C-alpha cells in the first residue's frame, strides 16, 4: 500500500547543498489531490514545515527559508526531491517526507521514517565495536546481560541489531553521547536466559551508513 522513504543519512559540509529524495509507492504523484511535503526536526526540538508540492506542480515553501529551497517531482520515477542550499550547522536535523491527507488542508497522514542530516565539516569515521561479555558480574540469578559497545564513529546514526534481527526482546540501545574527540559512543545491551550462554551464539550487527561500514561481532563469556 502507501509508503514513503527518504534517501539515506547524509553528512553535508557547511555552505554546501543538501539534496533529498523521497521515494513513494501506493499512489501516483499526479493523481488528483495527492501531495508530498517535507518536515524537519532538530534533535530534542520541535517539528518544522519546509515545503510541499501538489499533483498539479503547485509548490509552497516556508517563507523564512524560501531563498534556500527547491522542491520538485517526477511521476514516472515516483520521487519528490528537496534541495536546500547554503547549509549551516543549525540545519542539522531529522528530515521527513510525508503525504498530505486531504486535497486542500495541509496536514500529513503518511510519513517516511526520516533521515538524519548532519551539517559538519568533520570526516566520516566508522565505529569500533567491543564486546561487553556476560559474566557472574552480569548474571543476576537465572538471567544474564551482555552487549556491544559501539565506539568512535561520526556522524550519527548507527543502527544496531542482534542476530540479524531475530533477537529483539531485552534489547536496549542507548542514545549516543558526543565525546571530547568529536565522535559518538554508545552501548547496545541485551538480557537473555543463563542456561543458553553455552548454547546460543550472540552476535551484534552494527550498521553505519554514512561511512559505509558494517561490523559483526560475536559476544561470548570471557
Amino acid at each position: 500500500q502507501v509508503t514513503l522513504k527518504e534517501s539515506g543519512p547524509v553528512l553535508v559540509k557547511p555552505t554546501e547543498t543538501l539534496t533529498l529524495t523521497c521515494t513513494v509507492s501506493g499512489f501516483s504523484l499526479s493523481t488528483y489531490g495527492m501531495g508530498v511535503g517535507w518536515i524537519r526536526q532538530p534533535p530534542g526540538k520541535a517539528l518544522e514545515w519546509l515545503a510541499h508540492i501538489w499533483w498539479d506542480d503547485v509548490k509552497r515553501y516556508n517563507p523564512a527559508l524560501k531563498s534556500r529551497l527547491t522542491i520538485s517531482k517526477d511521476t514516472s520515477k515516483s520521487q519528490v526531491v528537496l534541495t536546500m542550499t547554503n547549509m549551516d550547522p543549525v540545519d542539522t536535523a531529522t528530515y521527513y517526507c510525508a503525504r498530505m491527507g486531504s486535497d486542500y488542508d495541509v496536514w500529513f497522514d503518511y510519513w517516511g521514517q526520516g533521515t538524519l542530516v548532519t551539517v559538519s565539516s568533520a570526516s566520516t569515521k566508522g565505529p569500533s565495536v567491543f564486546p561487553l561479555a556476560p559474566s557472574s558480574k552480569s548474571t543476576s540469578g537465572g538471567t544474564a546481560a551482555l552487549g556491544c559497545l559501539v565506539k568512535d564513529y561520526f556522524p550519527e546514526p548507527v543502527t544496531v541489531s542482534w542476530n540479524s534481527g531475530a533477537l529483539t526482546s531485552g534489547v536496549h540501545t542507548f542514545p549516543a553521547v558526543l565525546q571530547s574527540s568529536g565522535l559518538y559512543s554508545l552501548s547496545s545491551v541485551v538480557t537473555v536466559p543463563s542456561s543458553s550462554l553455552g548454547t546460543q551464539t550472540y552476535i551484534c550487527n552494527v550498521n553505519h551508513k554514512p561511512s559505509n561500514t558494517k561490523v559483526d561481532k560475536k559476544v561470548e563469556p570471557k
Binding site: 523564512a64 558480574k137 538480557t191
Partner: protein, 213 residues
C-alpha cells in the same frame, strides 16, 4: 507566523487516567488544528485533524475539541503505549506551524534496577583506552544516582550517562553509566565498583570486580 503554544510542557499520569493537553493559537484558526503522537525515533502519527475528526487508524480513547483560539486533546484510558511527545499543528493558514510539544510519561509501580557491570574488553585496552560500563536495567521512576568507585575512592568528570526513552510495554527506563580511563590509569588500580542509589532500593546496591580476574 501563527504561534502555537502547548500546555503543559510535561505530564505524568497513571494507566487508566485522562491526559488533557491544551494548544493555544495566537490568532483564530477556526477548526483547523491537527494533533500528532510521536514516539522516540519514529515519525509522528496523526491522531486528529480539523480539531475533532478522529483519523483513520486511531482508537476512540483519543478525542479533540475546541475552535478558533483554544484546543484540547484528550487521551482517555492511558495505557503504557501512550508514552510520547504530542504536537498540535494549524492547517488553516500559510505558513504552517507546529507547537513545541507536550511530553507524556506513563506511571508504573516502583521498580528497582537490576544492575550489572562490565570491565573493559581486553581488545579495547590494546588501543590505549578503557571503558568501564555500569548498566541499570528496567527501573521506575527515572531518578537514579550512579556513583563510581576506583579503589574505594570517588570519581568525577570521567563518567557519562545515557538513558533510554521510557519503554512502551512496561514503562521502565534503563540507564548506562560509562567510566573512561586511559590504559595506564586502568592497570594502576584494583577494584572497580559502581554504586547505585534508587527509590526501589532500601539501601544503595554496589556491583564490583577485581581488575583482570
Amino acid at each position: 507566523e501563527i504561534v502555537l503554544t502547548q500546555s503543559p510542557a510535561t505530564l505524568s499520569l497513571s494507566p487508566g487516567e485522562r491526559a488533557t493537553l491544551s494548544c493555544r493559537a495566537s490568532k483564530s484558526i477556526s477548526k483547523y488544528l491537527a494533533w500528532y503522537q510521536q514516539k522516540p525515533g519514529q515519525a509522528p502519527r496523526l491522531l486528529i485533524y480539523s480539531g475533532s475528526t478522529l483519523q483513520s487508524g486511531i482508537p476512540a480513547r483519543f478525542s479533540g475539541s475546541g475552535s478558533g483560539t483554544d484546543f484540547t486533546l484528550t487521551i482517555s484510558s492511558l495505557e503504557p503505549e501512550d508514552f510520547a511527545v504530542y504536537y498540535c499543528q494549524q492547517h488553516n493558514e500559510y505558513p504552517y506551524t507546529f507547537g513545541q510539544g507536550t511530553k507524556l510519561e506513563i506511571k508504573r509501580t516502583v521498580a528497582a534496577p537490576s544492575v550489572f557491570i562490565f570491565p573493559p574488553s581486553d581488545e579495547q585496552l590494546k588501543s590505549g583506552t578503557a571503558s568501564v560500563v555500569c548498566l541499570l536495567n528496567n527501573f521506575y521512576p527515572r531518578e537514579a544516582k550512579v556513583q563510581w568507585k576506583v579503589d574505594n575512592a570517588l570519581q568525577s568528570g570521567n563518567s557519562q550517562e545515557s538513558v533510554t526513552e521510557q519503554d512502551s510495554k512496561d514503562s521502565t527506563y534503563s540507564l548506562s553509566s560509562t567510566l573512561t580511563l586511559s590504559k595506564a590509569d586502568y592497570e594502576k588500580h584494583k577494584v572497580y565498583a559502581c554504586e547505585v542509589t534508587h527509590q526501589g532500593l532500601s539501601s544503595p546496591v554496589t556491583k564490583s570486580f577485581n581488575r583482570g580476574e
